[PDB]
Symmetry: D2
Subunit: 121 residues, 4 copies
């Protein structure tokens, strides 16, 4: 149930296909930051999750370069898909910017995004 | 020789074998020296294929879902960081390891850490 | 009067805090989850002269998970910001470090996020 | 406990701490980087009765980045463990939250890792 169009609390759009091989492929469009238009994503998910009520572990990466704007940064989301009547993907993320060695201590932002198939309002 | 493409090792002795594609793709295998993992796991990721021209590192990230034919750990790790070139080439990362959990156990689903990768084989 | 009070998070944990004029946070934490049993000492710091443009007040605190009931050999730090008003919130991210052997240090630290309501 | 003293991280920042009998950490922090200027107050907690199986001692502390010289409208928390041995170490991960508007809250928090030893930089 991972395949589809997802939205987070910021109103960003996460369009993803979950392949039989455990691959995630798609596009991400951020409502915030330096990003402009859709960016390529790739990731992985557990294609045979536990059947004890546990969620399905997954992660994906966006490098923030496309033909519109290169932000010289990359975000990875790590989380789990939680199935049901109102499906959710709950994630934590790390956004690393390319920095000088002197500035490496401030290279990485951390946050958390929750994704639903309904766009928040 | 120089570049992201190659075989990398972290401080734990894990092996990260990666090819950096022309269009920003990272593809390869990861073998962890620690945890539930056994043998090689598929990785995919992305990197900035046109980094800044001011001495900055190259932003990148990748994911391993910890399922292969040896063991399924029902977990996934993402590494986010940057590649630093030169004579002491590094990939410096922070990571998030999320385990599949029940909703009641979700608060303790995610480990955080940091891995530094070098092309030098451990001694 | 804003930060000072009793707060609950999404897990149902209880956060009792006094924000002093000197920038100090002092109080007790009781977790709804995990190894912890009963109230634990907290101490922390907050920006005692924040911006008023809609910007939150930066803060953080620590609990070492040792009391007379259970010693969990762990500590959590919460880092975040207080947002004032009738629906006041403390929005945090946290790091929970367990005492580990050097071999297990790679899996010493859990990360998460807690939102507190007054 | 071995925690009490002056510690230095990989950035050259100075961490002057006292570990009290009641589990308290008190002292000052001076960052070599960022908006911070001069010494800032810290407070924290540590496990005053750790395991005896070779495990580290869990601890954490907070600095709010306000002093008489500069207020950065930010706060860092370090969470980690003290590791005894030939060269003692405090290994930490940290979260640095800046006061932001609601619309900017997604980019409020930096994450990193600091390792402290008692070796003064030369
Ligand atoms: O500003 C940049 O460097 C690129 C855009 C980053 C947007 C971040 S990624 C994590 C968070 N979740 C979102 O949907 N957007 C922000
Ligand atoms: O135990 C698991 O759930 C799977 C193996 C996790 C290994 C982690 S990933 C982050 C860290 N870096 C490594 O090289 N290994 C550990
Ligand atoms: O299990 C332990 O080691 C001690 C209790 C940890 C409880 C954690 S702290 C962060 C999160 N927020 C809570 O209110 N409880 C959990
Ligand atoms: O820039 C600020 O907002 C205040 C100074 C932050 C300095 C950070 S705290 C984490 C890291 N470790 C250090 O010693 N300095 C930086």
């Amino acid at each position: 149930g991972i395949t589809g169009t997802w939205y987070n609390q910021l109103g960003s759009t996460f369009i993803v296909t979950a392949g039989a091989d455990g691959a995630l492929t798609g596009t991400y469009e951020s409502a915030v930051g330096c990003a402009e238009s859709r960016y390529v994503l790739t990731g992985r998910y557990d294609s045979a999750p536990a059947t004890d009520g546990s969620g399905t572990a997954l992660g994906w990466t966006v490098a923030w370069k496309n033909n519109y704007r290169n932000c010289h940064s990359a975000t990875t989301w790590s989380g789990q898909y939680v199935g049901g009547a109102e499906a959710r993907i709950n994630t934590q993320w790390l956004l690393t910017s390319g920095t000088t060695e002197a500035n490496a201590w401030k290279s990485t932002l951390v946050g958390h995004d929750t994704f639903t198939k309904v766009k928040p309002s």
